[PDB]
């Protein structure tokens, strides 16, 4: 890729766009459409549940904004403690993977600020690519566990903050490609 | 041992009808096992909600 003068702006604006989209998605208490309830006892019978991983809500009910935070409930003959079931519940009952992706991408933002502070450290921008890829992995694994639980039919449909979270992965890959161009430029500078 | 439990467990585990035993099982989410004639058991299993 040419235009190395603009590539620093293009990568930083892409990274900031990804960070804003991801943080809005994780802050938002809903991700994608489904049917169910807003809050248990549109409360019991019928509403579009605007599902989400960390928090969940609803849209176009007789009432709106009565959102909910994830919890768990018992089932017949238990089986809650099973090696698969307890694993799935312990994963699903936490905001781990999206908020870790947020933290990694924000530290990617703090990393690229080392283009101006602690300047001329060259290959240190290596850490940006690590942050982009690890944020991507955390995002995709979060979406995988989210959909894998949520898809159990409840007529799900994809929503705005979902589109933000998913798009942030592709943005993070394109930003990563530019960050690798930045790194290998710093490498060619170090080797002359 | 099961008799020693049933003769000592409380609230009284025994039921006056199969309908009551079924109710106690369903309320208990299977934490209560009702002991009954096989004809009753395999009747009820065929009756919805068939849980």
From Swiss-Prot, chain A:
Keyword Coiled coil on entry: no
Localization (cell): Membrane; Synapse, Synaptosome
Tissue specificity annotation: Brain.
Keywords tagged on the record: Calcium, Calcium channel, Calcium transport, Glycoprotein, Ion channel, Ion transport, Membrane, Phosphoprotein, Synapse, Synaptosome, Transmembrane, Transmembrane helix, Transport, Voltage-gated channel
Domain of life of the organism encoding this protein: Eukaryota
Residue intervals passing through the bilayer: 8-28, 94-114, 124-144, 164-184
GO CC terms in record: AMPA glutamate receptor complex; cell surface; cerebellar mossy fiber; glutamatergic synapse; hippocampal mossy fiber to CA3 synapse; postsynaptic density membrane; Schaffer collateral - CA1 synapse; somatodendritic compartment
Family label: Belongs to the PMP-22/EMP/MP20 family. CACNG subfamily.
Job of this protein: Regulates the trafficking and gating properties of AMPA-selective glutamate receptors (AMPARs). Promotes their targeting to the cell membrane and synapses and modulates their gating properties by slowing their rates of activation, deactivation and desensitization. Does not show subunit-specific AMPA receptor regulation and regulates all AMPAR subunits. Thought to stabilize the calcium channel in an inactivated (closed) state.
Quaternary structure and interacting proteins, as annotated: The L-type calcium channel is composed of five subunits: alpha-1, alpha-2/delta, beta and gamma. Interacts with the PDZ domains of DLG4/PSD-95 and DLG1/SAP97. May interact with GOPC. Acts as an auxiliary subunit for AMPA-selective glutamate receptors (AMPARs). Found in a complex with GRIA1, GRIA2, GRIA3, GRIA4, CNIH2, CNIH3, CACNG3, CACNG4, CACNG5, CACNG7 and CACNG8. Interacts with GRIA1 and GRIA2. Interacts with MPP2.
Disease: Defects in Cacng2 cause the stargazer (stg) phenotype. Stg mice have spike-wave seizures characteristic of absence epilepsy, with accompanying defects in the cerebellum and inner ear.
Name this polypeptide is given: Voltage-dependent calcium channel gamma-2 subunit
Gene: Cacng2
Curated annotation (Swiss-Prot), chain B:
Tissues showing expression: Detected in forebrain. Detected in dendrites of neuronal cells. Expressed in the pyramidal cell layers of CA1 and CA3 and in the granule cell layer of the dentate gyrus.
Source organism superkingdom: Eukaryota
Phosphoserine: residues carrying this PTM: 28
Induction: Down-regulated in the pyramidal cell layer of CA1 in the hippocampus by global ischemia.
Post-translational modification (record): Palmitoylated. Depalmitoylated upon L-glutamate stimulation. Ubiquitinated by RNF167, leading to its degradation.
Complex formation: Homotetramer or heterotetramer of pore-forming glutamate receptor subunits. Tetramers may be formed by the dimerization of dimers. May interact with MPP4. Forms a ternary complex with GRIP1 and CSPG4. Interacts with ATAD1 in an ATP-dependent manner. ATAD1-catalyzed ATP hydrolysis disrupts binding to ATAD1 and to GRIP1 and leads to AMPAR complex disassembly. Interacts with GRIP2. Interacts with GRIP1. Interacts with NSF via its C-terminus. Interacts with CACNG2, PICK1 and GRIP2. Interacts with GRIA1 and SYNDIG1. Part of a complex containing GRIA2, NSF and NAPA and/or NAPB.
Function in brief: Ionotropic glutamate receptor that functions as a ligand-gated cation channel, gated by L-glutamate and glutamatergic agonists such as alpha-amino-3-hydroxy-5-methyl-4-isoxazolepropionic acid (AMPA), quisqualic acid, and kainic acid. L-glutamate acts as an excitatory neurotransmitter at many synapses in the central nervous system and plays an important role in fast excitatory synaptic transmission.
Family named by the database record: Belongs to the glutamate-gated ion channel (TC 1.A.10.1) family. GRIA2 subfamily.
More about this protein: The postsynaptic actions of L-glutamate are mediated by a variety of receptors that are named according to their selective agonists. This receptor binds AMPA (quisqualate) > L-glutamate > kainate.
Protein name as annotated: Glutamate receptor 2
Organism: Rattus norvegicus (Rat)
Gene: Gria2
Complete-protein stretch covered: 690 to 740 of 883
